Amino acid sequence: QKKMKSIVEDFLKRLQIFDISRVPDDQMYRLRDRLRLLPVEIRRLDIFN
Amino acid sequence: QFDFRASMHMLTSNLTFTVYSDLLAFVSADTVEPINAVAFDNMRIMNEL
């Protein structure tokens, strides 16, 4: 039930150079798709394990 | 001419009943949360979440 748009919006906001008000939800979800294919960083992955 | 024998009848009917019209008013109808609504293929109608 969790819509992940908030996560990508936070990510883009913390990059500090983009204006998220100009970024549509479709682009945020395409970013989500690209992020979802990446492996987790080792420390974070071990903590989650 | 009026003839009593030829005019006397027994009329039969039901003692009492109630007629109803709105059949669907007897049905309690809920829906799932739209986030969980599925299509004919049993997957969520919208899956980009």
TrEMBL record, chain A:
Modification(s) after translation: Sumoylated with SUMO1 and SUMO2. Sumoylation of viral proteins seems to have a positive role on viral replication.
Domain of life from the UniProt record: Viruses
Membrane-crossing segments per the record: none
Compartmental location: Virion
Free-text note regarding domains: The N-terminus binds RNA. It is necessary for encapsidation of VP1 and VP3. The N-termini of 10 VP2 molecules form a cylindrical hub underneath each 5-fold axis of the inner capsid.
Quaternary context: Homodecamer; each decamer is made up of two conformers of VP2, called VP2A and VP2B. Interacts with a VP1-VP3 complex. Interacts with the intermediate capsid protein VP6. Interacts with NSP5. Interacts (via N-terminus) with NSP2.
Its job: Inner capsid protein that self-assembles to form an icosahedral capsid with a T=2 symmetry, which consists of 120 copies of VP2, with channels at each of its five-fold vertices. This capsid constitutes the innermost concentric layer of the viral mature particle. It encapsidates the polymerase VP1, the capping enzyme VP3 and the genomic dsRNA, thereby defining the core.
Family classification: Belongs to the rotavirus VP2 family.
Protein name: Inner capsid protein VP2
Organism of derivation: Rotavirus A (strain RVA/Monkey/United States/RRV/1975/G3P5B[3])
